Amino acid sequence: GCPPCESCHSGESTFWCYWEALCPPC
């Protein structure tokens, strides 16, 4: 139900994973 969080990896949207900025709270 809750939108997928910013799953970080070697690259990609990893910055947003540390800030949890784009990641919406479930």
Coordinates of C-alpha atoms in Angstrom, one line a residue:
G1 CA 0.0 0.0 0.0
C2 CA 2.8 2.4 0.9
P3 CA 5.0 3.6 -2.0
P4 CA 8.3 1.8 -2.5
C5 CA 11.2 3.3 -0.6
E6 CA 14.5 4.5 -2.1
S7 CA 16.4 1.2 -2.1
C8 CA 20.1 2.1 -2.4
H9 CA 22.8 0.0 -4.0
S10 CA 26.3 0.6 -5.3
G11 CA 25.0 3.5 -7.3
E12 CA 21.7 4.8 -8.6
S13 CA 19.4 6.6 -6.2
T14 CA 21.7 5.9 -3.3
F15 CA 21.9 9.5 -2.1
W16 CA 18.2 9.6 -1.5
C17 CA 18.5 6.4 0.5
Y18 CA 20.8 8.0 3.0
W19 CA 18.7 11.1 3.3
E20 CA 15.4 9.2 3.0
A21 CA 14.3 12.4 1.3
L22 CA 12.3 10.9 -1.5
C23 CA 11.4 7.8 0.5
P24 CA 7.9 8.2 1.8
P25 CA 7.0 6.9 5.3
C26 CA 5.0 3.6 5.3

